RNA sequence: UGAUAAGAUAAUAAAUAUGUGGUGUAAACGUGAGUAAUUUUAUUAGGAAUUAAUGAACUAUAGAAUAAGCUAAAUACUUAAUAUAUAAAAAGGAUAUAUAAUAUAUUUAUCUAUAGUCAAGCCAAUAAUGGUU
RNA sequence: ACAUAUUAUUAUCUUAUUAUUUAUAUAAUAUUUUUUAAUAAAUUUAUUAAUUUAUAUUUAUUUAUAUCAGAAAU
């Protein structure tokens, strides 16, 4: 679609790979602070310059983001319990209690 | 064994009582039941030994909390640290938010200023925790003739033995105290005298809403001498003691009154056989501010 | 045996319809 | 999508060439297991238009056959449509604007065909 | 705010799913061991006992959402109050605004009732491999 | 013959667990109930620990019946 315009929180493109997070701020050198190519380059640009499928989409998730004014913040993947997967808690649990209170 | 040792074991004691679970409680402290206790062999927290039987606890006096606050060091954290304990409890249990009463609050505040030598932090633990006071329904506590009076002659000690003579702070900070108060029942009539003290002190004029004129209605404790009762009636009055004599000693206006006066010969004759509460409190703050 | 009571009373109840089929006929 | 009764799409056709019948379904049951009714059809894939007809202005259509009371009795019921059925729904005319979502919202964009319903 | 800084309070911005809670796993998926039918299958314009104060979870409508206790605290749990012979309930959170914690408003939840939708239990008739050595 | 494996059955033996049903407790908890100390507050009342009292809910043991399973016989 148009080009957004930079703000305050997000200057420039290296603003806007660390607030999204999920490690985006390897791609630092791939855009080179461009603010066109990252409001530009759909996902077979980005495929072409080795981001892969998961970083790619999510960039393109955030961009989206950002052009309708909505908040880009870092949202986490989620993550098994510190216990483990509930197909495998019972047998962690028992392990996990006669290890370390006995 | 010293006083203070023997009155903390006291307090400790019945704080873990009304701190444990209610389930449990018949199964610990009960003794009928110290054998049902080993069988379920319930585990101590903290992965500690299973619980053991404990001597069944009774409602405690309020002279165990004065025995324990005089017994602070000079510079120590035991009394601070204690009611950050004491006041972290639940305010659903009514024994320990209805143990403190108006008298403990002036025998901390007084004790922290002339003898423990921590005033400010243990007006600061008065005032953070006043709001849970006020949900545990004890909210007589912060009164005039234990809360507000006392804070205001530890004030006028302190503008003196530190010299603060800003007109502003002064202000503020007796605004926040009035502001503090939650049951504003003026008896004595030494708290208008306190607080106009104290503006002559700091150059400044007192204006407080509802603190209206009393006139002085000073306690005489009778000539008769008791035993055990007239040792209570004196450590009764022993708060405004401390609130005559400092009226009079750190300003000359007070001496107009002659109210102030009677109390003191009928308090100081009443056992002047014994020391004085006022000037012991004074050598303290002296050893206090040399370090 | 409660299991040997109600055996002997069924066995005791089919003797009697047996006995009963033979003075039926 | 919530309820126990659900409008929504069951796949058919052969790998690579997907096709879908548009469904009354139990919520638990499978995606393509028999369902209470089938309202209609739904090809995804757009009729090609030839370059004449392109510049001609001819837009691809999808076509979707649906039976369009029954469709409207199981809404009136409180069946509940999936996202996607509920786009097609919107587009139908039976649905309004009360079914968007704030994603979808099309508030500003340019109406360049107005719904026509005809005879043929 | 605390006369010296340990803490408290509120606002804002983050963190925590190794604490207490909620919802979800009777489905789907896989398999064909058992099962020859008081049970399983298929069928019928079949039936009654003439099927619950059951909603499981959405729709429409109406009303309600009270007091204590227990836990560190709660939309956890327990005991009560009031609600179709009558019986049988519940829960707040977020965000604004005005007040001096309370009230409204918005939003999202909780409980009850009536109907709908989905969905259940039971029975009959008929048929369902081989051997009477 | 028979040595094996599998299954089923029982007027038999043993039996986990569970359901139901007995008897018992100076059993626990709550409330009621009879008193009794200790403590506290106030200047009788409250709390805690006991005792008496019934009530409900549990717990332990116990009686009987059925029961996974195993043994024996067929
Ligand atoms: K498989
Ligand atoms: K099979
Ligand atoms: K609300
Ligand atoms: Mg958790
Ligand atoms: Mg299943
Ligand atoms: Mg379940
Ligand atoms: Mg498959
Ligand atoms: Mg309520
Ligand atoms: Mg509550
Ligand atoms: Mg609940
Ligand atoms: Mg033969
Ligand atoms: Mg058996």
Same mark, same amino acid.
């Given at each position: 679609?148009?080009?957004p315009?930079?703000?305050d929180?997000?200057?420039?493109?290296?603003?806007?790979?660390?607030? /999204?997070? *999920?490690?985006?701020?390897?791609?630092?050198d791939?855009?080179?602070?461009?603010?066109?190519?990252?409001? =530009?380059?759909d996902?077979?640009?980005?495929?072409?310059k080795?981001?892969?499928?998961?970083?790619?989409?999510?960039?393109?998730?955030?961009?989206?983001?950002? *052009?309708?004014?909505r908040?880009?913040?870092?949202?986490?993947?989620?993550?098994?319990?510190?216990?483990?997967?509930?197909?495998?808690?019972? #047998?962690?649990?028992?392990?996990?209690?006669?290890?370390?209170?006995? | 064994?010293?006083?203070?040792?023997?009155?903390?074991?006291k307090?400790?004691?019945?704080?873990?009582?009304?701190?444990?679970?209610?389930k449990?409680?018949?199964?610990?402290?009960?003794?009928?039941?110290?054998?049902?206790?080993?069988?379920?062999?319930?585990?101590?927290?903290?992965?500690?030994?299973?619980?053991?039987?404990?001597?069944?606890?009774?409602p405690?006096?309020?002279?165990?909390?004065?025995?324990? /606050?005089?017994?602070?060091?000079?510079?120590?954290?035991?009394?601070?640290?204690?009611?950050?304990?004491?006041?972290?409890?639940?305010?659903?249990?009514? #024994?320990?938010?209805?143990?403190?009463?108006? /008298?403990?609050?002036?025998?901390?505040?007084?004790?922290?200023?002339?003898?423990?030598?921590?005033?400010?932090?243990?007006v600061?633990?008065?005032?953070?925790?006043?709001?849970?006071?006020?949900?545990?329904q004890?909210?007589?506590?912060?009164?005039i003739?234990?809360?507000?009076?006392?804070?205001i002659?530890?004030?006028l000690?302190?503008?003196?033995?530190?010299?603060?003579?800003?007109?502003? /702070?002064?202000? *503020?900070?007796?605004?926040?105290?009035?502001?503090?108060?939650?049951?504003?029942?003026?008896?004595?009539?030494? #708290?208008?005298?306190?607080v106009?003290?104290?503006?002559?002190?700091?150059?400044?004029?007192?204006?407080?809403?509802?603190? =209206?004129?009393?006139?002085?209605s000073?306690?005489?404790?009778?000539?008769?001498?008791?035993?055990?009762?007239?040792?209570?009636l004196?450590?009764?009055?022993?708060?405004?003691?401390?609130?005559?004599?400092?009226?009079l000693?750190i300003?000359?206006?007070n #001496?107009?009154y002659?109210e102030?006066?009677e109390?003191?010969? =009928?308090? =100081?004759?009443?056992?002047?056989e014994?020391?004085?509460?006022?000037?012991?409190?004074?050598?303290?703050?002296?050893?206090?501010?040399?370090? | 045996?409660?299991?040997?009571?109600?055996?002997?009373?069924?066995?005791?109840?089919?003797?009697?319809?047996?006995?009963?089929?033979?003075?039926?006929? | 999508?919530?309820?126990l009764?659900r409008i *929504?799409?069951?796949?058919?056709?052969?790998?690579?060439?997907?096709?879908?019948?548009?469904?009354?379904?139990?919520?638990?049951?499978?995606?393509?297991?028999?369902?209470?009714?089938?309202?209609?059809?739904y090809?995804?894939?757009?009729?090609?238009?030839?370059?004449?007809?392109?510049?001609?202005?001819?837009?691809?259509?999808?076509?979707?056959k649906?039976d369009?009371?029954?469709?409207?009795?199981?809404?009136?019921?409180?069946?509940?449509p999936?996202?996607?059925?509920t786009?097609?729904?919107?587009?139908?005319?039976?649905?309004?604007?009360?079914?968007?979502?704030?994603?979808?919202?099309?508030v500003?964009?340019?109406?360049?065909f107005?719904?026509?319903?005809?005879?043929?």
């Amino acid at each position: 679609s148009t080009i957004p315009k930079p703000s305050d929180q997000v200057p420039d493109v290296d603003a806007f790979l660390n607030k /999204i997070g *999920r490690n985006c701020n390897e791609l630092k050198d791939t855009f080179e602070n461009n603010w066109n190519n990252l409001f =530009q380059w759909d996902s077979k640009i980005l495929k072409e310059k080795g981001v892969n499928i998961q970083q790619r989409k999510y960039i393109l998730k955030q961009v989206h983001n950002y *052009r309708n004014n909505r908040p880009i913040h870092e949202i986490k993947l989620g993550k098994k319990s510190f216990f483990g997967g509930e197909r495998k808690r019972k #047998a962690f649990t028992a392990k996990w209690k006669a290890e370390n209170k006995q | 064994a010293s006083t203070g040792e023997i009155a903390k074991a006291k307090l400790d004691e019945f704080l873990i009582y009304h701190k444990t679970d209610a389930k449990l409680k018949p199964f610990i402290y009960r003794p009928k039941n110290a054998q049902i206790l080993l069988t379920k062999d319930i585990r101590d927290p903290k992965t500690r030994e299973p619980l053991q039987p404990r001597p069944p606890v009774k409602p405690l006096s309020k002279q165990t909390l004065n025995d324990f /606050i005089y017994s602070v060091e000079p510079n120590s954290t035991e009394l601070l640290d204690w009611f950050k304990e004491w006041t972290g409890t639940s305010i659903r249990k009514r #024994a320990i938010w209805t143990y403190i009463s108006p /008298i403990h609050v002036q025998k901390m505040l007084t004790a922290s200023f002339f003898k423990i030598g921590k005033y400010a932090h243990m007006v600061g633990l008065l005032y953070g925790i006043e709001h849970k006071f006020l949900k545990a329904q004890n909210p007589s506590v912060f009164d005039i003739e234990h809360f507000f009076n006392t804070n205001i002659m530890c004030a006028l000690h302190r503008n003196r033995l530190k010299d603060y003579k800003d007109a502003e /702070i002064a202000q *503020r900070k007796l605004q926040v105290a009035w502001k503090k108060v939650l049951n504003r029942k003026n008896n004595t009539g030494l #708290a208008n005298i306190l607080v106009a003290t104290l503006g002559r002190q700091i150059g400044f004029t007192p204006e407080l809403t509802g603190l =209206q004129p009393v006139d002085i209605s000073l306690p005489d404790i009778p000539n008769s001498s008791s035993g055990a009762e007239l040792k209570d009636l004196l450590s009764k009055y022993e708060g405004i003691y401390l609130i005559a004599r400092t009226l009079l000693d750190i300003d000359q206006h007070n #001496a107009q009154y002659l109210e102030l006066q009677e109390f003191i010969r =009928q308090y =100081q004759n009443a056992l002047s056989e014994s020391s004085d509460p006022y000037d012991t409190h004074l050598k303290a703050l002296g050893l206090l501010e040399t370090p | 045996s409660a299991k040997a009571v109600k055996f002997l009373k069924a066995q005791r109840r089919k003797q009697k319809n047996e006995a009963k089929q033979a003075t039926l006929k | 999508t919530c309820g126990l009764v659900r409008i *929504r799409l069951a796949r058919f056709g052969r790998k690579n060439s997907p096709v879908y019948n548009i469904v009354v379904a139990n919520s638990r049951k499978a995606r393509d297991a028999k369902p209470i009714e089938v309202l209609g059809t739904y090809v995804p894939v757009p009729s090609p238009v030839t370059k004449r007809e392109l510049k001609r202005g001819v837009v691809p259509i999808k076509d979707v056959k649906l039976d369009f009371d029954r469709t409207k009795y199981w809404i009136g019921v409180g069946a509940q449509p999936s996202e996607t059925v509920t786009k097609l729904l919107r587009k139908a005319g039976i649905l309004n604007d009360a079914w968007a979502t704030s994603k979808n919202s099309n508030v500003n964009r340019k109406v360049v065909f107005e719904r026509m319903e005809t005879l043929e």
